[PDB]
Amino acid sequence: VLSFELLHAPATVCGPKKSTNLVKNKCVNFNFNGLTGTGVLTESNKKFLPFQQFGRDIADTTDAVRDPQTLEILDITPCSFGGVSVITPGTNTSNQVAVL
């Protein structure tokens, strides 16, 4: 019988997967020994205690993550998004549009 816990503590065992290099300022889907997510990675100046790895905010969201291998702190921000509105006159008058 094998029993797991899948806690958020610093991981110890992992799959036989490989590792790539860090890329910044580009929308990427990071996977740091788990913890899947998409966003833009920059350099975070937030002070971390030696035992502190994960960052969190008023509504969590895990804004800060520490590198597992190189042991560097990072900041996480979601990619830009928004709605689209179309500005048009009546189709009787014309058929040109402008988007917002």
Binding site: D57, T61, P78, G82, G83
Partner: peptide, 23 residues
């Protein structure tokens, strides 16, 4: 600079997301 009365200034001086926005 904003061209408002002293009383209006006094009144005006007394008063990261997922799908939420303000218009």
């Amino acid at each position: 600079p904003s061209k408002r009365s002293p009383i209006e200034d006094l009144l005006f001086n007394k008063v990261k997301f997922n799908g939420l926005t303000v218009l």
